[PDB]
Amino acid sequence: DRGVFDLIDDWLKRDRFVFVGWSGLLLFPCAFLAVGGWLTGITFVTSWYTHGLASSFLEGCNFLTAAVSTPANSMGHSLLLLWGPEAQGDITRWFQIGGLWTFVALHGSFGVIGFCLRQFEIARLVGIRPYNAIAFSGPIAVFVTVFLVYPLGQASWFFAPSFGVAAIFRFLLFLQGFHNWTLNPFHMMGVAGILGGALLCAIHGATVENTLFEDFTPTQSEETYSMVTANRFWSQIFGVAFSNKRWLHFFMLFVPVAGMWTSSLGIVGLALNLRSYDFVSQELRAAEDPEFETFYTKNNLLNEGIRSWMAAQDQPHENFIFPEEVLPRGNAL
Amino acid sequence: MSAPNPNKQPVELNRTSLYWGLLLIFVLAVLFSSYFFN
Amino acid sequence: MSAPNPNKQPVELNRTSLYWGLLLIFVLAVLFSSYFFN
Amino acid sequence: EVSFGAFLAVILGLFIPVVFLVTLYIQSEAQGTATNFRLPDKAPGVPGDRYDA
Amino acid sequence: EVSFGAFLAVILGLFIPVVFLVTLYIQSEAQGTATNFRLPDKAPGVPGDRYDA
Amino acid sequence: MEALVYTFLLIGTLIVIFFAIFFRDPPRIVK
Amino acid sequence: MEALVYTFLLIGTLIVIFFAIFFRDPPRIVK
Amino acid sequence: ESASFWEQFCAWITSTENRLYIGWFGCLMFPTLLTATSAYIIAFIAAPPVDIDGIREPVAGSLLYGNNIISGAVVPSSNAIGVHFYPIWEAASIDEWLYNGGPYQLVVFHFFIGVCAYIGREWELSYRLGMRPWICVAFSAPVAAAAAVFVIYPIGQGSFSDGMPLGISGTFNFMLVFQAEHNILMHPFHMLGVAGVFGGSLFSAMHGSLVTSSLIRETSENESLNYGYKFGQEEETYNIVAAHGYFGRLIFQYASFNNSRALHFFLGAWPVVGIWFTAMGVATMAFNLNGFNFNQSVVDSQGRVINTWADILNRSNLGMEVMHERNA
Amino acid sequence: DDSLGFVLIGVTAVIGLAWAQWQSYQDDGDDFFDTYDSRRAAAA
Amino acid sequence: PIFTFRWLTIHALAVPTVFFLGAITSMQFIQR
Amino acid sequence: MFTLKILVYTVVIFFISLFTFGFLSSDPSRNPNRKD
Amino acid sequence: IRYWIIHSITIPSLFVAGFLFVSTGLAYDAFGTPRPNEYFTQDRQQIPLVNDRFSAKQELEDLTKG
Amino acid sequence: ALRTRLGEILRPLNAEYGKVAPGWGTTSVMGVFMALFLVFLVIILQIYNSSIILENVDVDWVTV
Amino acid sequence: MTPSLSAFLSSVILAVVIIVIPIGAALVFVSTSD
């Protein structure tokens, strides 16, 4: 248009094979480095000096067991920059101390910021409301709390999840054994939103496909399915039914997104070990009365079994020499 | 200045929204009562 | 029959009656709290 | 010895009638009948005009 | 030991928002805006017509 | 005392569900 | 916590009195 | 010439004017589901502890016996019963019936019959209303998951004590014991189920935000936009081309599901197929076809075992397993 | 009662006679050539 | 050679992918 | 108890027979596209 | 067709370069990944873990030597 | 609208609604201060993170 | 000037020199060209 800023603005918003925009200056390099850094780590970089594990394709791992493992516990919450005082420019030592994890997590953090900015930018360019950006704040809150806020409250980056399939599976059982994360009401609200979102996806797609009108042309001014028939069906099957199409689609937004946001609030509490581990009255009752036993008390026994049997190898920086007599067993109870 | 305020608006809450609110509050109480009591 | 009921009537409570009820309930609570607590 | 039942008697014995009076007045404001400075009902269900009008 | 403050948390945590929702709906019924099966507002402060007249 | 509160909460939830089913806003088709 | 309840009740009564005085229904003379 | 009583009964049962449709499938659904509902409520509120293990150590599951809503459950049947049919009339006393976990069998069997009849009832109402009958196929996936978790896993393991308890903490206990014994996390079918559930939430939020974003202006300022849609209207309530252009520019030039039919088919199909596969994974793990075992997969030149993340997962599984196998 | 088969036989008889009463005034003797029978004699 | 966006972007993905694919293939011939 | 078994048996058989004889009562005709 | 004939030589060149990067052991030295014969040494039978933050570079060098 | 003694006093402070500097104004100076603020925030973060270790600065609890 | 401080200064200079300035110059060139 007028100035040099206007030509750059016109070039970035030009209709090409992939939209760039101003957010693409932040999204495209950060997302490419995070994904490229993750693919580099699962292929070549080991976790031998941080976890005592082999976690790369070079060492014999497959796609399920390879991971970009977290830094060593001695690193603390260091940013672990390549030029930082830990690696001092040595990229080989940087890979061995787990600096690739902070590389993927930090560039991935600015990647999801750039993607949400991209959602805002395209919505303003097309001219629609920015509800996709609000819906993406759910995954942003989950990524920020789990991969950044939770290790920042813990001892080090070591206790964050590692970028891998089986490594994430360990992180699930770690938070169950150490925090009783299933008993947290914030995770329960998260399960309700995520399972409810899958229900809403299945039930809405089936209803539209089955209340279809006998005739989708892209420029169809009329609706392709009968809302009256769909409302009549679910009112007699379930008792209640949607009657507003706009409320039905806000609800499809709200339920899974609120599940991500509610579970993220509990992870923040888990960062400071403010966990919902026990019911004190039920724990006191089982102490005085050994015959007393509920499913919650049986679960706390399994949490003790998780903690003591993994701690020797899950946290190798600490020695944790546990003899067989102190290892909890249901047999010798 | 003790004049009729033009920004005054009526407030609505239809029966569906009332049922959603009652269900949300009752289910939240059901979920959090065990944690509050212990 | 589910006809429109002609005996339906609106219910009225002016601000003076609201203030009288609030004063009565608060004063009754003030009077009886000492006896309930002991 | 904080009597637990006595606390609920004071709280719920105050909250519930206050709520009932507040709810009655608010729907009275919506119907335009929350003032005593208005004429008697013109018709069944139709409140009279206010004195200021 | 019955946690005294926990009883108020369950009771007042349930009663107060239920009261707020019930009070909002009742005054909405007085204004004829407590149904979603009505047209949008024809004017500011004037609710739209119901679908069945 | 706690079990009474739990039972009251669950029964109240079921009452709310009953009212939401049978005393719902009747759907009217726009003309 | 009994004294807290007593103080809350007395202050609430005074608040109700304040609202009844200064936010009363304004008297209008009929014409 | 008068109408027979059976004709009036058939007219009332299959009537579309009832507030809740009954139908012939509902003739099985309503008494079974109301039986299981009242029995579950009674057993949840007040029921004596059930000796699930079979060795005279009972587990309390009712509210009146000292547990809350989270820890409350209808405890599964006793290990002494196994997969034996245990009705209330085959027990010597009501006390012995409640001691052996009979309420679990009653509630589970009535609930299973009720949800199968619910599938049939969904088809039935779809038939009476003249619509396409595949909502019941979509509901067949959570029904399959419930069947695998309540009936089929006890069949494979040989005891209804191994079924999922009808409670929250009991569900978590079932999940932990199942992971310890079968490694469901490393099963490909549970990966497909997690992909289905995560993707279903993604697609639900995506579709909802896309429709909510492109709503056509029909209301005034700060009024709820939901009044812009009229129930029974023919015209579209949102701008489909604007949402398609946004979704196209979001990822790559032409990626929007331009045909809404296949978009909604994909929405209805993805989590249903995922839940089908995770139900079949749970059902196949009942017969000891466990998940992937990548234990001791990395060794050095001298034969020493280098652990992987699967080894740490196995250590967690071993801890849960040794705390579950009470004097094996 | 005693052998539990009379409960089975007795109940399906009672509902069976009600169904047979409905079936009596059904003009289904003639055979149709269609995917389903749309003929249902509703008395009232 | 140099397109405005396309040549640099698709070569930023294709060049490391083929190099990685050759590296993955060589790992299958390592005896451990 | 034998009486409870008798009552449950007759209730179950009653509802099953309702289902069975209802689906035999010309069910495919009970559809809105019925040809008169 | 001119770009196809240069892709016919560069794609095999890049695939061979990735193949030789692993088969010659250059991938182990570049990334610090230990070979199967150097997970443990004669003087170190335990898992080599970094115990200090700011001496991590020196600690890795006095432990991976030889 | 009501005119008060304090309202007449504060009147020139709210009398410049919609007044702008034409064009880009002082955006170039603002971007420099934003860039300097970003570098400053990274410095004090890396000092706290011990990614920058200064000469006589020890990030630990101090006495007196 | 400690090695960590010098490394930080080199990182800032490097980011400006090989990331911000080349991308901005390329953007200006392709915006004026196209």
Ligand SMILES: C=Cc1c(C)c2cc3nc(c4c5[nH]c(cc6nc(cc1[nH]2)C(C)=C6CC)c(C)c5C(=O)[C@@H]4C(=O)OC)[C@@H](CCC(=O)OC/C=C(\C)CCC[C@H](C)CCC[C@H](C)CCCC(C)C)[C@@H]3C
């Ligand atoms: C595990 C589950 C999961 C995954 C993998 C996922 C993935 C995705 N969702 C997206 C979108 C969305 N997801 C949404 C809601 C949801 N998403 C959910 C769950 C998920 N969503 C749930 C549960 C919801 C419901 C609230 C919405 C509303 C959107 C979108 O609008 C967006 C979209 O367009 O979808 C069509 C895309 C973001 C693209 C992007 O940022 O590119 C840029 C690339 C970046 C930023 C790189 C990220 C780097 C990450 C953070 C760290 C590195 C990770 C490694 C590369 C891989 C590690 C893998 C191991 C851990 C196993 C991507 C396909």
Ligand SMILES: CC(C)=CCC/C(C)=C/CC/C(C)=C/CC/C(C)=C/CC/C(C)=C/CC/C(C)=C/CC/C(C)=C/CC/C(C)=C/CC/C(C)=C/CC1=CC(=O)C(C)=C(C)C1=O
């Ligand atoms: C004695 C007793 C009772 C004992 C029981 C003990 C016990 C186990 C108690 C249960 C406790 C309990 C309820 C726990 C749950 C607590 C908990 C986790 C609460 C979550 C709270 C919360 C705030 C979570 C945040 C996430 C969130 C918002 C989740 C909400 C999930 C939710 C309600 C989803 C909707 C589910 C659902 C069934 C929707 C179907 C909608 C439907 C009918 C659509 C059909 C339809 C489709 C169409 O396409 C069209 C077109 C039309 C027209 C149409 O109609």
Ligand SMILES: CCCCCCCCCCCCCCCC(=O)OC[C@H](COP(=O)(O)OC[C@@H](O)CO)OC(=O)CCCCCCCCCCCCCCC
């Ligand atoms: C689960 C169980 C739920 C139970 C909830 C219980 C709700 C019960 C609440 C109702 C009682 C309160 C309603 C009063 C509301 C009220 O009083 O309104 C005043 C009302 C005004 O009458 P009008 O006919 O003018 O009112 C027109 C309408 O506006 C009234 O609705 O007169 C009366 O009701 C007559 C009784 C006079 C009573 C005077 C009492 C004042 C006593 C003094 C106060 C104490 C001060 C002491 C100082 C020493």
Ligand SMILES: CC1=C(/C=C/C(C)=C/C=C/C(C)=C/C=C/C=C(C)/C=C/C=C(C)/C=C/C2=C(C)CCCC2(C)C)C(C)(C)CCC1
């Ligand atoms: C870290 C780092 C960095 C970065 C780097 C990068 C950026 C990289 C990239 C990388 C990359 C970028 C790579 C890639 C790779 C790829 C691959 C590895 C692929 C593979 C593939 C495959 C394997 C496939 C498969 C399949 C599927 C998936 C489906 C269908 C079937 C098939 C089979 C075909 C730097 C330098 C800055 C420095 C610092 C450090």
Ligand SMILES: [Fe+2]
């Ligand atoms: Fe839709």
